[PDB]
Amino acid sequence: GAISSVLNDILSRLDPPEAEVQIDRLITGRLQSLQTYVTQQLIRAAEIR
Amino acid sequence: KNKCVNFNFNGLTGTGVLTESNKKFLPFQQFGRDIADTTDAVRDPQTL
Numbered sequence: 001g002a003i004s005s006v007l008n009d010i011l012s013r014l015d016p017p018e019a020e021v022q023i024d025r026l027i028t029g030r031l032q033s034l035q036t037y038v039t040q041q042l043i044r045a046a047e048i049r
Numbered sequence: 050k051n052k053c054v055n056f057n058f059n060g061l062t063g064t065g066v067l068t069e070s071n072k073k074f075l076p077f078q079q080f081g082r083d084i085a086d087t088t089d090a091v092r093d094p095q096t097l
Contacts, residue, residue: 011062
């Protein structure tokens with residue numbers, strides 16, 4: 001949902017108050033991406049053991 | 050070169066070690082990207 005996936009672009013374009021909105025969108029999704037990875041690794045961890 | 054530096058080229062901001070690359074870009078090509086879509090290499094606009 002962010003204007004651009006590059007953080008440097010958001011900081012080099014939008015003002016400080018406007019950049020926080022775009023950066024929050026990227027962080028929120030990247031959190032879900034890590035949660036998906038760890039979730040799968042824990043499942044596979046039970047299989048390999 | 051051969052040092053980690055903050056480079057800004059044609060408005061592209063980033064931090065990385067600058068080194069000479071053997072990859073040949075066609076005259077029209079500008080910036081390359083790796084498997085991760087991150088910049089693989091850049092081009093100095095003044096001295097090509």
